């Protein structure tokens, strides 16, 4: 089974490079061209380039200059880099490969790498309590960077009424994100929750209990 | 003795069960006498209660509850002084020493128990419990206590021992003619004050006793009522201060002695400090600090701010932080020392995106008055523009310059607006340089002689491109007249390095009070100190010779010996244990009331009462 | 350079009705266009190549036709798992290019918030600032308003929102809204509430603490 698995940064800061490894199994490189496209959000999706098979390469107009793809058929490896980075470079960025031979629909998809292009350093969030008075009841993820953060609940054994949401940008630069669940409010006195919050990018993790 | 503090969670469970236990034990293994309280809860069966053989007194109280254990050995315990209670007015109380399991505390031997101080007793819930209800505790408990007592007693997990023909009315703690009640309270005489070794008027306790006693002497109580102090018990450890007849003033009384529980020691136990009123307690409080005198430990009431010291800029929290900043400054609250650099930076005031950091309100900088000592450096990039002097390190005695700003500088005051740098009290710079530039309004640095400050060889002065010596000069921008020719840190007289007369606290003055002002002053080594308070200011003569009330020229109030006081002593302690008490005659001199002016006399003899 | 033009921007539909996209060419490109499907936080999905070819592991509801400059995607019949972003790619000029897609909402009855407010946390205050959070919970459609009132003042320009995508099984929105103010602020005024309008509301519904 064709898969890619992609591996590389979070973080890069302006004017230096990007890196991202793309390791694939379930088939050969030495007969599959390897392609490389992005999303932004205010972008949607956009074509970078591609080795095939062959060893050559072929790089969209905008990157042809800072742009480097190279591979290891042996290692079944493609290595992406990008170099002079700033902050309209930042997006998801994914390797692909196509259905068939020599074409361009992308049937197989790296699962993406996030990278931020920012000048600025990582933080690790401060979790605060969103208590009730059904019931609601929630965490608030403050002040972290950069993305992504993750949360669970009780460990991931209530994911019933759970809604977290879309981060936002926070004016000091930073974000900031809630996660509430609602239960019956006859759960209050008798069932403990907690948030489990985990920021990879700064190995930071906490676990929140919430009561009145 | 050995002593133990105790704890205070009552009710509280501590993790779990063994978790728990094991705290139970590390706190009073070995344990002789509890300071505080005795709690023993939510011991298992099978767990062993044996180290609490060792305990023969808590002061504060003692608390049973939740115990399965079917024994709790507290078989020495003499003494509960109650200090404290639990709930209400109980001073013991056993309760609810059973589980769902229907198994529960059997034997309470306190054959010991002989004195309940204060408070009174609580049982309730114990199905298991044995013996227990035989117990006269008239004998034990004050009579106060006697109506706010709470004793349930109802055996229903198993069948118990029965006591001893020995046992006075059949009154036991458990099995064994040892365990039978021992009563001292009583079956004394009509004639006995308190305690008793026996019914006859012969065996009778002195009055300083509880529990009870092998003689009748204050030296032979089985538990002070009050205190001990080595073998005799006494009302209050002899005090540490005494009147003296012969000098008139308060001298330490050479058999004086310190309060430690309920005990009088002569040097506190290791670790513990003494207090301002003689106490012995582990640690100092927030407003002093601890010393050494005459190999005591001593607590005394800090000066200024009690010394504080903190990390500088890149070490501990401050790790990685560029400078002084929005976020790290709340952390120099009450620092009177920085182990390590001060930064300053531009980046301060600007704020800083790249490290999410707000910009700084000026007037946190007032954070920083504490700081007496910077072993680092101190650099200085920024200041608020409307500020004329450098006011945050007003109180800043020393800069130690271990480390130095490129290996080079111990103190860098760059491009500022300031027009003064306002470092009064910067006694010294150990070592590295001291560079000041690009401060267009700055006027005074010159007239500083840096060679005074600097503590090593090799330390050099750079002052340029700062306010023109001349504009300096031209603007009136120059030292105070009462300054010394050894330069200021600004135009105020206490901005001066030295006196070119006196001074007064930090102030330079031209002249001390000494014969007109209404603090009446005199001069030591160019120094302006306050006359006694007590010394009554003199019409063109000087009004005191020194400190204190014996160099008064004349008193104010009224004279004891020597000395001029406010008011005659009275009421204070003396020899002999007695109170001292004075009266103030026509020439408004204290003498001596009669021994019989039991509350004072407001003249001699008995006539006076 | 060859545009993909992809209509509408947000295409609202029932479920098991039929759901046509539009992705036009700039132009005429014959059938080198191919669809994919992307699911919130998922990889782009290959839905049809070529216009109208089946692709192996696709559901049979998803058929693609045209030819020329407008080329469609359909989904006779709509389901819940279909909610997503779905994207044309040109093949025919280089650079390959995708267009900016069409996402697709589903209908349902109209359905009132649920709505919560939440003061900052004691914790929150120990480090100088409180947000406040409004939290609408399980709404549709998605337009909503929050009002943030502070002693029967409107704030403004001191509140961020932030909305869920569309709900798996009840195909809801829900809406967190945080007020922002220093601990001073915070502390200077009384009433703080909440305001809701929305149209399975009969009047604006406000929810408040001092
Ligand atoms: C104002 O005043 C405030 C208060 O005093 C100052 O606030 C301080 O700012 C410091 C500097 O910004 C800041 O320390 C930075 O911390 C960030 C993030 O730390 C967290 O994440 C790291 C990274 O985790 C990942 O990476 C490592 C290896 O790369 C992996 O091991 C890990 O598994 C992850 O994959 C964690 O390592 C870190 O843990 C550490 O701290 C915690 C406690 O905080 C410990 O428990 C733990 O054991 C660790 O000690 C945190 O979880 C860091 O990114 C940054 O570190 C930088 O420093 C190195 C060497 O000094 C430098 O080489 C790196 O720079 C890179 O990034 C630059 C941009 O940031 C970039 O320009 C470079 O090119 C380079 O790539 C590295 O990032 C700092 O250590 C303090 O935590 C913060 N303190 C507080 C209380 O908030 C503020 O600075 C002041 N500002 C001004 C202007 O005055
Ligand atoms: C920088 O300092 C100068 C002098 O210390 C300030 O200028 C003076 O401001 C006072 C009022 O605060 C006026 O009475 C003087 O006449 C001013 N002297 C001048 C203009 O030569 C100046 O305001 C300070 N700069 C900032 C930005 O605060
Ligand atoms: C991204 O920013 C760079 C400037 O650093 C610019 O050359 C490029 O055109 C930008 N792309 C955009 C705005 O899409
Ligand atoms: C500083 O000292 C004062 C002494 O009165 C105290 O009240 C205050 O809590 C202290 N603050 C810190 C941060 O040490
Ligand atoms: C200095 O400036 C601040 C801010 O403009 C102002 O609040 C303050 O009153 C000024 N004067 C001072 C601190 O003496």
């Known amino acids: 089974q064709v898969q890619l698995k992609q591996s590389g940064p979070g973080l890069v800061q302006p004017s230096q490079s990007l890196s991202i490894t793309c390791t694939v199994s379930?088939?050969?490189?030495?007969?599959?061209?390897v392609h490389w496209v992005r999303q932004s959000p205010g972008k949607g999706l956009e074509w970078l380039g591609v080795?095939?098979?062959?060893?050559?390469?072929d790089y969209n107009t905008p990157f042809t200059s800072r742009l480097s793809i190279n591979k290891d058929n042996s290692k079944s490896q493609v290595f992406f880099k990008m170099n002079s980075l700033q902050s309209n470079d930042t997006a998801i960025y994914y390797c692909?490969?196509?259905?068939?031979?020599?074409?361009?629909?992308?049937?197989?998809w790296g699962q993406g790498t996030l990278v931020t292009v920012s000048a600025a350093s990582t933080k690790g969030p401060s979790v605060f309590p969103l208590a009730p008075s059904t019931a609601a009841l929630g965490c608030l993820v403050k002040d972290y960077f950069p993305e992504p953060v993750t949360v669970s609940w009780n460990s991931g054994a209530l994911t019933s009424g759970v809604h977290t949401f879309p981060a936002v940008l926070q004016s000091s630069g930073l974000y900031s994100l809630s996660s509430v669940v609602t239960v019956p409010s006859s759960s209050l006195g008798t069932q403990t929750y907690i948030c489990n919050v985990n920021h990879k990018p700064s190995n930071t993790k906490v676990d929140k209990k919430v009561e009145p | 003795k050995k002593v133990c503090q105790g704890t205070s969670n009552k009710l509280t469970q501590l993790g779990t069960f063994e978790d728990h236990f094991l705290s139970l034990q590390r706190m009073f293994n070995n344990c002789e006498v509890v300071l505080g309280n005795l709690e023993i809860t939510y011991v298992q069966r099978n767990y062993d209660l044996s180290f609490l053989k060792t305990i023969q007194e808590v002061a504060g109280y003692v608390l049973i509850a939740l115990n399965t254990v079917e024994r709790i050995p507290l078989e020495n315990l003499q003494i509960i002084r109650g200090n404290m209670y639990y709930e209400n007015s109980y001073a013991l109380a056993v309760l609810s020493n059973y589980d769902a399991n229907k198994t529960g505390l059997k034997e309470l031997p306190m054959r010991n128990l002989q004195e309940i101080l204060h408070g009174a007793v609580r049982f309730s819930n114990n199905p298991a419990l044995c013996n227990v209800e035989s117990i006269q505790w008239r004998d034990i408990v004050s009579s106060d206590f006697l109506s706010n007592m709470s004793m349930d007693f109802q055996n229903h997990l198993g069948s118990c021992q029965k006591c001893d023909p020995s046992c006075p009315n059949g009154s036991c703690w458990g099995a064994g003619e040892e365990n039978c009640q021992k009563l001292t309270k009583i079956i004394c005489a009509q004639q006995c004050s308190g305690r008793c070794r026996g019914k006859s008027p012969s065996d009778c306790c002195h009055n300083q006793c509880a529990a009870g006693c092998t003689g009748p002497r204050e030296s032979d109580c089985l538990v002070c009522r009050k205190f001990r102090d080595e073998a005799t018990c006494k009302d209050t450890c002899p005090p540490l201060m005494l009147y003296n007849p012969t000098t008139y003033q308060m001298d330490v009384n050479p058999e004086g002695k310190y309060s430690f529980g309920a005990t009088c020691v002569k040097k506190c136990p290791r670790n513990y400090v003494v207090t301002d009123h003689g106490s012995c307690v582990r640690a100092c409080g927030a407003d002093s600090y601890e010393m050494e005198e005459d190999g005591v430990r001593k607590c005394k009431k800090c000066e200024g701010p009690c010394r504080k010291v903190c990390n500088g800029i890149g070490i501990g929290e401050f790790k990685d932080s560029l400078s002084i900043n929005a976020t790290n400054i709340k952390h120099f609250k009450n620092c009177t020392s920085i182990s390590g650099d001060l930064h300053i930076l531009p980046v301060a005031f600007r704020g800083d995106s790249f490290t999410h950091t707000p910009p700084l309100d000026p007037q946190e900088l007032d954070i920083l008055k504490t700081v007496k000592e910077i072993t680092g450096f101190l650099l200085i990039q920024a200041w608020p523009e409307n500020r004329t002097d450098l006011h945050a390190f007003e109180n800043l005695e020393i800069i130690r310059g271990r480390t130095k700003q490129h290996g080079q500088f111990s103190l860098a005051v760059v491009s500022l607006n300031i027009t003064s740098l306002g470092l009064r009290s910067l006694k010294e710079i150990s070592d590295g340089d001291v560079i000041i530039s690009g401060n267009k309004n700055l006027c005074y640095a010159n007239t500083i002689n840096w060679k005074k400050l600097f503590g090593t060889s090799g330390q050099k002065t750079k002052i340029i491109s700062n306010r023109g010596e001349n504009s300096c000069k031209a603007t009136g921008q120059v030292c105070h007249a009462l300054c010394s020719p050894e330069g200021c840190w600004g135009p105020e007289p206490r901005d001066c390095v030295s006196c070119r007369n006196v001074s007064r606290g930090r102030e330079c003055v031209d002249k001390c009070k000494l014969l007109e002002g209404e603090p009446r002053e005199f001069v030591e080594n160019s120094e302006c100190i306050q006359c006694h308070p007590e010394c009554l200011p003199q019409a063109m003569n000087i009004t005191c010779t020194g400190r204190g009330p014996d160099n008064c020229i004349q008193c104010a109030h009224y004279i004891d010996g020597p000395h001029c006081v406010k008011t005659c002593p009275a009421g204070v302690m003396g020899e002999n244990n007695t109170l001292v008490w004075k009266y103030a005659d026509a020439g408004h001199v204290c003498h001596l009331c009669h021994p019989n002016c039991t509350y004072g006399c407001t003249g001699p003899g008995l006539r006076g009462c | 350079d060859i545009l993909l033009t992809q209509s509408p921007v947000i295409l609202s539909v029932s479920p098991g009705e039929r759901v046509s996209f539009s992705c036009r060419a700039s132009?005429?490109?014959?059938?080198?266009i191919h669809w994919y499907q992307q699911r919130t936080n998922g990889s782009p999905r290959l839905l049809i190549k070529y216009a109208d070819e089946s692709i192996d592991g696709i559901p049979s509801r998803f058929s693609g036709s045209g030819s020329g400059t407008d080329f469609t995607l359909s989904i006779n019949s709509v389901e819940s798992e279909d909610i997503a972003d779905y994207y044309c790619?040109?093949?025919?000029?280089?650079?390959?290019?995708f267009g900016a897609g069409t996402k697709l909402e589903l209908k349902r009855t109209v359905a009132a918030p649920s709505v919560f407010i939440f003061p900052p946390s004691d914790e929150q205050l120990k480090s100088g600032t409180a947000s406040v959070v409004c939290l609408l919970n399980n709404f549709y459609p998605r337009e909503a308003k929050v009002q943030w009132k502070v002693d029967n003042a409107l704030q403004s320009g001191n509140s961020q929102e932030s909305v869920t995508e569309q709900d798996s099984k009840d195909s809801t929105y829900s809406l967190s809204s945080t007020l922002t103010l220093s601990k001073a602020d915070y502390e200077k005024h009384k009433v703080y509430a909440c305001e809701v309008t929305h149209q399975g509301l009969s009047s604006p519904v406000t929810k408040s603490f001092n």
């Open positions: 379930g088939f050969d490189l030495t007969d599959y061209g």
């Open positions: 080795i095939w098979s062959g060893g050559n390469t």
């Open positions: 692909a490969r196509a259905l068939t031979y020599y074409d361009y629909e992308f049937a197989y």
């Open positions: 790619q040109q093949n025919n000029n280089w650079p390959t290019t």
């Open positions: 132009q005429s490109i014959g059938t080198n």
